[PDB]
């Protein structure tokens, strides 16, 4: 099939700006070309075709140019609503093939995270687990580091991390980390601490409690 | 008003079969030329199959021998995907998605159908309440919900049955050892908790399980 490389495969961009992306095919493609729009949770939308026929429904502030196997989307003046995962298309040739996509996210200003830590639920501990959580709340950029203790000593063992996507109200980040631990082993041990590290600070915030 | 509306997606063990369905609605269905997409789960969007007014008039992606089948009543207005041998990385959204006219240009996509290939029992979760650590101070205080252990995906977690939106984030589930976990966090002002109720709804569709996990104080 023709291959489809598309470029950047994500970028930041501040409201108001222009974005553009680029799309190169393996061969000669002649406008049998689609750009195409995944906002976050949904199905894709068709935006453009025959590299630069724009949808009905679609705003003016979507452009497609480009001929033979260079091809482009630009976006001259980003909204909101505009974030989300663009495809490219071929349908020259079938099986018709998609770029890989170039994910639009949102620029803002640094922001600290707001921890809290969770001990086990007394009704996890009944069944014989105990997990200690830890989350993160409304950050800014992206990248974070957790560092969990256990009586002062580092574990990294059983530790599961998740991100959530861009926030859609403040576009900070958010994320969750589970300490997995056996009861037997939680019980064995007294202080549980979180400690994150931000570019926001030098120091990590830090959050324990004591099994008492 | 044009509709596509896919259907017939699940689980189903590695070498086991599937049919998916596409009821289609606002429009001449018998004169639109209609496709399968699919979207696994690193968002990689491929061509399954194509097929014209004909039935016999079908192209596919990967025409081994018995794999893919795709076909149309246009008298129920419905499209078909017949899924036979299925392998683990069969696992993917399916689109269903309609042609403007006589080349492969798509207009409208449906909502697509989840499929997910595996040989792990489905398994009910189990939801525990994040209460803060014993203690109690500040302006706002943050509570949780942690959803653990089951499988497929997906649960739905709402707060207060959708009314408590604002301050919500929830954590996109995660595979842990074969089973998945998903938590969630809601942050309200330190007046408002716990002298008004609030509480986790979990939705496991594929075990039929639904929890409503009302969040107390620890104690002592
Ligand atoms: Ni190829
Ligand atoms: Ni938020």
């Known amino acids: 099939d023709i291959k489809m490389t598309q470029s950047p495969s994500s970028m930041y961009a501040s409201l108001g700006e222009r974005v553009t992306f680029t799309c190169k095919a393996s061969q000669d493609i002649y406008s049998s070309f689609s750009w195409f729009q995944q906002r976050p949770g949904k199905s894709p939308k068709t935006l453009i075709y025959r590299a630069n026929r724009l949808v009905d429904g679609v705003p003016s502030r979507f452009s497609g140019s480009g001929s033979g196997q260079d091809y482009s989307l630009t976006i001259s003046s980003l909204e909101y609503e505009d974030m989300g995962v663009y495809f490219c298309?071929?349908?020259?040739?079938?099986?018709?093939?998609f770029g890989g996509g170039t994910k639009l996210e949102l620029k803002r200003t640094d922001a600290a995270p707001t921890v809290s830590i969770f001990p086990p639920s007394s009704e996890q501990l009944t069944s014989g687990g105990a997990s200690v959580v830890c989350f993160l709340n409304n950050f800014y950029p992206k990248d974070i580091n957790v560092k969990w203790k256990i009586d002062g000593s580092e574990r990294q063992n059983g530790v599961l991390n998740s991100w959530t996507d861009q926030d859609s109200k403040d576009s900070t980040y958010s994320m969750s980390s589970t300490l997995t631990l056996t009861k037997d082993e939680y019980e064995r041990h007294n202080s549980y601490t979180c400690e994150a590290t931000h570019k926001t600070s030098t120091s990590p915030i830090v959050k324990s409690f004591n099994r008492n | 008003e044009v509709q596509l509306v896919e259907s017939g997606g699940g689980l189903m063990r590695p070498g086991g079969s599937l049919k998916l369905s596409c009821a289609a609605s606002?429009?001449?269905?018998?004169?639109?030329?209609m496709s399968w997409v699919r979207q696994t789960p690193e968002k990689r969007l491929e061509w399954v199959a194509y097929?014209?007014?004909?039935?016999?008039?079908?192209y596919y992606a990967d025409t081994e021998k018995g794999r893919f089948t795709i076909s149309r009543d246009n008298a129920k207005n419905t499209l078909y995907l017949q899924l036979s041998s299925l392998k683990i990385e069969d696992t993917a959204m399916y689109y269903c998605?309609?042609?403007?006219?006589?080349?492969?240009?798509?207009?409208?996509w449906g909502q697509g159908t989840s499929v997910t290939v595996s040989s792990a029992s489905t398994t009910a979760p189990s939801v525990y309440p994040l209460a803060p650590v014993c203690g109690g101070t500040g302006s706002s205080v943050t509570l949780g919900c942690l959803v653990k252990g089951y499988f497929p995906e997906p649960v739905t977690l709402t707060w207060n049955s959708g009314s408590l939106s604002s301050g919500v984030h929830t954590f996109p589930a995660l595979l842990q050892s074969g089973l998945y976990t998903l938590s969630s966090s809601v942050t309200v002002t330190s007046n408002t908790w716990p002298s008004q109720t609030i509480t986790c709804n979990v939705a496991h569709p594929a075990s039929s399980t639904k929890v409503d996990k009302k969040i107390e104080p620890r104690v002592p």
């Open positions: 606002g429009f001449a269905f018998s004169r639109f030329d």
């Open positions: 097929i014209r007014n004909g039935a016999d008039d079908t």
């Open positions: 298309l071929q349908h020259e040739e079938f099986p018709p093939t």
């Open positions: 998605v309609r042609h403007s006219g006589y080349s492969y240009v798509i207009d409208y």
